[PDB]
Amino acid sequence: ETAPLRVQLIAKTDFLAPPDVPWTTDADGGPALVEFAGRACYQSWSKPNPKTATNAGYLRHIMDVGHFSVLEHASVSFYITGISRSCTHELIRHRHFSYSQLSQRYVPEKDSRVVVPPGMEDDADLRHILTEAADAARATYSELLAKLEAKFADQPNAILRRKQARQAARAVMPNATETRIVVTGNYRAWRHFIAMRASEHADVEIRRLAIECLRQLAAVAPAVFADFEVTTLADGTEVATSPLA
Amino acid sequence: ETAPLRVQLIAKTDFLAPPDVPWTTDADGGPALVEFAGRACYQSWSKPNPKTATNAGYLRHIMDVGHFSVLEHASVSFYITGISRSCTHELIRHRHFSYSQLSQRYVPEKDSRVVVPPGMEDDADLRHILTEAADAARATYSELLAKLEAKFADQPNAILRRKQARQAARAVMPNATETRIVVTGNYRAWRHFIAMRASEHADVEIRRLAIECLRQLAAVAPAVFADFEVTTLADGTEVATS
Amino acid sequence: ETAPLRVQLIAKTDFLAPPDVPWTTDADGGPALVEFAGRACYQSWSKPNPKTATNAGYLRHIMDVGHFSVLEHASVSFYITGISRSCTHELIRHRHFSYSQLSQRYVPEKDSRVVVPPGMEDDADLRHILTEAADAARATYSELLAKLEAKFADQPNAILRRKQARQAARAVMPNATETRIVVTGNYRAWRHFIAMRASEHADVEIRRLAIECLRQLAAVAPAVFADFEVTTLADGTEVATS
Amino acid sequence: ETAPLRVQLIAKTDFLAPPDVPWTTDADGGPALVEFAGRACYQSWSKPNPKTATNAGYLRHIMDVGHFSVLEHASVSFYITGISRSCTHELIRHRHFSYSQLSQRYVPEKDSRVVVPPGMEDDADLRHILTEAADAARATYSELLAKLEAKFADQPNAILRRKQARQAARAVMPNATETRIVVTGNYRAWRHFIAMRASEHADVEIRRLAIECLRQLAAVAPAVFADFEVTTLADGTEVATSPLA
Ligand SMILES: Cc1cc2nc3c(=O)[nH]c(=O)nc-3n(C[C@H](O)[C@H](O)[C@H](O)COP(=O)(O)OP(=O)(O)OC[C@H]3O[C@@H](n4cnc5c(N)ncnc54)[C@H](O)[C@@H]3O)c2cc1C
Ligand SMILES: Cc1cc2nc3c(=O)[nH]c(=O)nc-3n(C[C@H](O)[C@H](O)[C@H](O)COP(=O)(O)OP(=O)(O)OC[C@H]3O[C@@H](n4cnc5c(N)ncnc54)[C@H](O)[C@@H]3O)c2cc1C
Ligand SMILES: Cc1cc2nc3c(=O)[nH]c(=O)nc-3n(C[C@H](O)[C@H](O)[C@H](O)COP(=O)(O)OP(=O)(O)OC[C@H]3O[C@@H](n4cnc5c(N)ncnc54)[C@H](O)[C@@H]3O)c2cc1C
Ligand SMILES: Cc1cc2nc3c(=O)[nH]c(=O)nc-3n(C[C@H](O)[C@H](O)[C@H](O)COP(=O)(O)OP(=O)(O)OC[C@H]3O[C@@H](n4cnc5c(N)ncnc54)[C@H](O)[C@@H]3O)c2cc1C
Ligand SMILES: O=c1[nH]c(=O)n([C@H]2C[C@H](O)[C@@H](COP(=O)(O)O)O2)cc1Br
Ligand SMILES: O=c1[nH]c(=O)n([C@H]2C[C@H](O)[C@@H](COP(=O)(O)O)O2)cc1Br
Numbered sequence: 011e012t013a014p015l016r017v018q019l020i021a022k023t024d025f026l027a028p029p030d031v032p033w034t035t036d037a038d039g040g041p042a043l044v045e046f047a048g049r050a051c052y053q054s055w056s057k058p059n060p061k062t063a064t065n066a067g068y069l070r071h072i073m074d075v076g077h078f079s080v081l082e083h084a085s086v087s088f089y090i091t092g093i094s095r096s097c098t099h100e101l102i103r104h105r106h107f108s109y110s111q112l113s114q115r116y117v118p119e120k121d122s123r124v125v126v127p128p129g130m131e132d133d134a135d136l137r138h139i140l141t142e143a144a145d146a147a148r149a150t151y152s153e154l155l156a157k158l159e160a161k162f163a164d165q166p167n168a169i170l171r172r173k174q175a176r177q178a179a180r181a182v183m184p185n186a187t188e189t190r191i192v193v194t195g196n197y198r199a200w201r202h203f204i205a206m207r208a209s210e211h212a213d214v215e216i217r218r219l220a221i222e223c224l225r226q227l228a229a230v231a232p233a234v235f236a237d238f239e240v241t242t243l244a245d246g247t248e249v250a251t252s253p254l255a
Numbered sequence: 256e257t258a259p260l261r262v263q264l265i266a267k268t269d270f271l272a273p274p275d276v277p278w279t280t281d282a283d284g285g286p287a288l289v290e291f292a293g294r295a296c297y298q299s300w301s302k303p304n305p306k307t308a309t310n311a312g313y314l315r316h317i318m319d320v321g322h323f324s325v326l327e328h329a330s331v332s333f334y335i336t337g338i339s340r341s342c343t344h345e346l347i348r349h350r351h352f353s354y355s356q357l358s359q360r361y362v363p364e365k366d367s368r369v370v371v372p373p374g375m376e377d378d379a380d381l382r383h384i385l386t387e388a389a390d391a392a393r394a395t396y397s398e399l400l401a402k403l404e405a406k407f408a409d410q411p412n413a414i415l416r417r418k419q420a421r422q423a424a425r426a427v428m429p430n431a432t433e434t435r436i437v438v439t440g441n442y443r444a445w446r447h448f449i450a451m452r453a454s455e456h457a458d459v460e461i462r463r464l465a466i467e468c469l470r471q472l473a474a475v476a477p478a479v480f481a482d483f484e485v486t487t488l489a490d491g492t493e494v495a496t497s
Numbered sequence: 498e499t500a501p502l503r504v505q506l507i508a509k510t511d512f513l514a515p516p517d518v519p520w521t522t523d524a525d526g527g528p529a530l531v532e533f534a535g536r537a538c539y540q541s542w543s544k545p546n547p548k549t550a551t552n553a554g555y556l557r558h559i560m561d562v563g564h565f566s567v568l569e570h571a572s573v574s575f576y577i578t579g580i581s582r583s584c585t586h587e588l589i590r591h592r593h594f595s596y597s598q599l600s601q602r603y604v605p606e607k608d609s610r611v612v613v614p615p616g617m618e619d620d621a622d623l624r625h626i627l628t629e630a631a632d633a634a635r636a637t638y639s640e641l642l643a644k645l646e647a648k649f650a651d652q653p654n655a656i657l658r659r660k661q662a663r664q665a666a667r668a669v670m671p672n673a674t675e676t677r678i679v680v681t682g683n684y685r686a687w688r689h690f691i692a693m694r695a696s697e698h699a700d701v702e703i704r705r706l707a708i709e710c711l712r713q714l715a716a717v718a719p720a721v722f723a724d725f726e727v728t729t730l731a732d733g734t735e736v737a738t739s
Numbered sequence: 740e741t742a743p744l745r746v747q748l749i750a751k752t753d754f755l756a757p758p759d760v761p762w763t764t765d766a767d768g769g770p771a772l773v774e775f776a777g778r779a780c781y782q783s784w785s786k787p788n789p790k791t792a793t794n795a796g797y798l799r800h801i802m803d804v805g806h807f808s809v810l811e812h813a814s815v816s817f818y819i820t821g822i823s824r825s826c827t828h829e830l831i832r833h834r835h836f837s838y839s840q841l842s843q844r845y846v847p848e849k850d851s852r853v854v855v856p857p858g859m860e861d862d863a864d865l866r867h868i869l870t871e872a873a874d875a876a877r878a879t880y881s882e883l884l885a886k887l888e889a890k891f892a893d894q895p896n897a898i899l900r901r902k903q904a905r906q907a908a909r910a911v912m913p914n915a916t917e918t919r920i921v922v923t924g925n926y927r928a929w930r931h932f933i934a935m936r937a938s939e940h941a942d943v944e945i946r947r948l949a950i951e952c953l954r955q956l957a958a959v960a961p962a963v964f965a966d967f968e969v970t971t972l973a974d975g976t977e978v979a980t981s982p983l984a
């Protein structure tokens with residue numbers, strides 16, 4: 011059973027301007043918050059320059075002059091499924107994010123799906139070799155678990171003795187095992203992730219993930235991510251580049 | 256002129272549950288996001304127990320059990336004014352917040368306000384010594400500025416000439432000079448900030464700040480901040496403990 | 498082929514007291530640096546108190562009064578082998594360390610070792626089920642790799658060709674696969690790691706790593722890591738608590 | 740009275756190669772640790788490439804391909820004196836350092852020194868204005884301190900009484916007041932600080948600090964800091980620029 015990548019946006023920033031500040035803007039939520047924060051450094055609430063007189067204009071300028079720390083005020087959360095364990099192992103190396111991830115120490119592996127590496131996707135023979143190997147691993151897991159459950163029956167706590175058995179049984183589960191994860195980060199963190207992972211140096215799985223995150227981030231905060239350009243490589247995979255990263 | 260502490264909540268989490276996840280809860284925003292993230296770890300979406308089906312009950316349990324990392328998903332931002340420079344010098348030592356602060360390099364301080372230390376708030380004579388000293392500093396600052404702008408006549412760029420002068424002139428501005436700051440943190444970082452700063456060991460200025468943030472945070476997310484109990488000290492200042 | 502846990506201490510803080518500061522202590526390296534930094538807050542260079550007039554006494558005082566940020570100045574690095582991929586996936590959730598880890602994308606995984614879960618180390622039957630499962634996975638790996646290199650045959654860069662094949666082939670490699678990692682952290686990060694992972698709540702594999710790290714750290718900085726008491730549980734695994 | 744900038748290197752990395760790894764290098768300390776960490780990723784313990792078979796060649800390569808995360812393993816600590824309170828307020832915005840700083844709540848300041856802004860150092864008239872204002876501020880501080888100690892007489896704990904008094908009295912102390920601070924960071928953090936602070940956009944005081952840190956860092960680890968070129972500006976201050984990050 012194979013699992014496709016799904017990225018669901020589950021949280022963003024709600025903004026409410028302070029009533030006493032003599033400033034309004036062209037925008038809502040995160041992008042308005044970022045402008046407000048930038049202007050707070052200068053206490054410059056008026057709008058002399060027509061170019062930076064819209065929210066998008068202001069943000070593009072903030073970006074251009076390298077005031078990136080202002081972007082940290084707004085955050086976005088995704089719920090991600092159809093991502094492999096090897097992919098999450100790379101993702102969580104990014105330390106300016108917060109994560110909550112499906113636990114193999116706790117969750118049943120009996121119905122677990124696998125994620126096909128993008129370089130194999132179009133090849134039914136390779137996919138077959140993968141899913142068969144995954145079926146073999148799952149049978150092994152159930153084998154180990156049954157025996158381990160009996161070994162750790164001594165222990166009164168239901169939650170402990172279930173962890174002890176599954177945590178050892180998990181040893182046979184492959185890299186391609188599906189996982190699920192809530193990832194939260196601010197705009198500055200999201201931008202770094204995209205610059206690092208939406209590139210030809212990156213594994214094609216996390217690259218695909220980064221591109222999908224960028225597309226969804228651009229939908230909620232266009233002005234913040236507009237400097238990123240998506241291009242398609244010879245193999246048809248997608249990369250994103252920005253002059254500011 | 257003096258400036259009182261003002262704390263204004265300007266941003267918080269907006270949550271939309273994923274349509275295809277078979278789960279609901281009796282909350283929205285940050286508290287609902289926290290519960291979703293917690294349950295994602297176990298895929299424990301079904302809620303058969305109607306006596307543990309509440310968001311508040313789940314959030315309390317998350318913290319009884321000590322899974323504090325789940326709290327990081329939700330954030331709140333404040334715009335804080337009427338805070339002194341010595342106070343922000345303490346505040347910014349907290350490395351899990353994001354900040355945007357009023358710049359003395361960029362902002363003229365000829366009209367700047369003073370923040371009165373809570374310890375001298377009820378002594379008019381002491382406040383007078385402070386405001387007189389502030390006025391003298393501001394005069395010195397204006398004297399230095401004019402003399403620096405001339406010393407920097409060599410600079411053809413008028414914006415840069417004014418920044419070079421201002422950043423040097425700022426040297427005489429006192430600790431009690433008002434500043435203004437946007438502070439953003441997730442629930443975990445706010446909790447830690449409150450624990451450290453709303454305590455008898457902390458300076459009264461930042462303690463006042465922490466108690467006020469707490470009061471607003473507790474209204475926004477009761478279950479997350481309910482464990483903190485405010486206590487009034489012998490001297491009338493407030494502390495908070497969990 | 499199985500791999501035992503090995504933790505090797507490969508780096509630590511070298512301290513040189515600045516000459517024109519009227520202060521000395523009965524210690525070296527990391528512990529000495531921590532006292533220097535704590536004393537710099539107070540400029541308390543002379544030692545009026547005979548109790549904290551020793552380095553060990555000064556550090557125990559720092560801890561009791563809760564001044565844990567001073568511990569961040571000193572650091573230690575380990576090279577860890579005989580750790581599984583599922584163990585590293587847990588370890589790297591600690592965001593206040595720095596890591597350099599063996600790459601499956603970059604390193605040919607021919608003759609990879611497997612780490613046996615401590616829970617089945619005494620069970621020869623369970624070990625065998627594991628090791629032949631691992632053997633089957635490596636066989637599948639070689640089969641995919643060969644087909645993948647054939648598939649990407651067009652790709653002109655041969656290095657990039659092997660990498661594209663290897664990153665996809667790695668898909669069948671089990672959690673138990675051995676990995677190797679350099680981990681660097683300051684004393685405060687190390688203490689937090691030990692507290693969270695040398696506990697009954699934690700997986701037994703990371704718990705074992707945390708205990709061994711603790712033993713080596715306590716040998717390097719006794720005063721910093723002394724409060725941790727190691728006790729053997731019912732099943733004969735160790736936990737450490739302070 | 741006035742305090743000159745002083746930067747003292749007080750800690751760095753001690754390295755010992757694990758005996759059972761088949762690798763040696765010609766370097767010691769931080770730079771050797773960085774090579775070890777980089778080789779661990781590839782388990783490339785042998786040395787086939789005369790271009791990367793030395794520590795300097797290896798680090799040259801690490802720097803060119805930009806895997807700066809391996810630089811995080813080595814650290815350096817300085818004790819910095821003759822820095823102003825406005826300079827530390829900028830410095831501590833860098834969140835990947837660790838700090839221990841002289842406390843005004845805790846340490847008496849009746850006799851504290853003043854730091855002259857670089858843009859003012861050459862001018863006797865401006866220096867006099869500054870020192871005169873500092874003398875006035877210290878007199879006010881003393882005046883406030885005594886009255887506050889008297890106002891807080893109903894605190895039986897004299898230590899607390901002096902602190903309660905001092906923390907309020909410090910209200911009048913100017914930005915130019917000298918402070919002292921231990922700063923610890925890894926190589927990657929120091930590179931970022933230098934890049935951000937030893938620049939034309941930065942305040943002259945912190946730029947002077949960054950340059951001195953850079954000078955000491957590049958003497959200790961020349962391969963790590965070689966890309967930073969020191970340039971004298973027209974006003975006689977120095978900046979540092981690099982093609983890298
Ligand atoms: C193609 C590629 C190949 C890779 N190969 C390997 C490999 O072989 N082995 C391996 O172990 N990893 C490898 N990685 C992981 C990589 O080295 C980083 O650890 C990971 O990508 C996180 O990115 P980041 O380093 O920018 O840190 P993040 O955690 O994403 O932090 C963001 C930024 O914050 C700063 N920062 C965060 N923490 C610190 C700190 N403690 N000190 C100083 N500054 C800090 C840095 O500026 C950093 O850029 C690879 C990554 C890529 C994309
Ligand atoms: C027994 C146990 C069970 C676990 N179960 C799960 C699970 O089911 N699912 C899952 O995804 N993870 C799980 N984890 C991982 C856990 O939630 C943490 O992510 C991990 O242990 C890292 O430790 P830490 O949260 O204390 O933070 P670290 O990353 O080690 O940071 C140390 C300290 O820095 C501070 N800090 C760091 N980053 C932030 C931040 N951005 N905001 C505010 N403060 C910050 C906090 O004070 C923190 O305590 C589990 C861990 C344990 C030990
Ligand atoms: C010339 C100049 C002008 C400035 N003007 C102002 C101003 O007017 N107002 C003001 O408030 N500040 C101002 N600053 C401060 C500036 O915004 C930064 O806060 C400070 O320089 C720290 O640098 P850093 O942002 O790169 O963060 P560092 O703390 O130095 O972090 C290093 C890297 O880690 C990563 N990182 C750290 N924390 C996070 C996070 N929480 N989320 C995502 N990534 C993270 C980023 O990649 C960052 O580059 C100014 C600084 C300079 C040099
Ligand atoms: C009453 C009191 C007195 C103080 N006195 C002094 C003083 O005299 N001199 C002085 O310099 N400072 C002093 N401070 C500042 C204090 O040391 C901290 O720097 C500040 O309170 C920030 O809090 P924090 O250390 O918990 O770190 P935060 O930056 O708030 O981080 C939150 C958590 O993240 C983790 N974390 C963040 N960064 C790291 C890191 N690099 N390594 C490991 N873990 C990390 C820690 O778990 C920490 O608890 C004082 C603070 C208080 C409240
Ligand atoms: O592109 C990469 N991304 C990444 O995050 N790593 C980190 C993740 C993991 O902690 C370790 C080994 O990763 P791979 O097995 O995916 O190569 O290095 C390595 C490479 Br190459
Ligand atoms: O209660 C405190 N809070 C705090 O943040 N510091 C930090 C802030 C600054 O970096 C340095 C000196 O602070 P004070 O001048 O406010 O003591 O230590 C110190 C004390 Br005591």
Ligand SMILES: O=c1[nH]c(=O)n([C@H]2C[C@H](O)[C@@H](COP(=O)(O)O)O2)cc1Br
Pocket residue numbers: 102111112113114115116583586587588590698699700
């Ligand atoms: O004890 C734990 N330690 C841990 O680090 N995690 C993190 C690591 C990974 O990101 C995710 C899933 O971990 P397990 O598969 O090991 O449960 O949660 C979870 C548990 Br439970």
Ligand SMILES: O=c1[nH]c(=O)n([C@H]2C[C@H](O)[C@@H](COP(=O)(O)O)O2)cc1Br
Pocket residue numbers: 347356357358359360361825828829830832940941942
């Ligand atoms: O060059 C700068 N460096 C800096 O760190 N800040 C931060 C420091 C402080 O938190 C706030 C105001 O700093 P200045 O008063 O030094 O501008 O912004 C601002 C500027 Br401009």
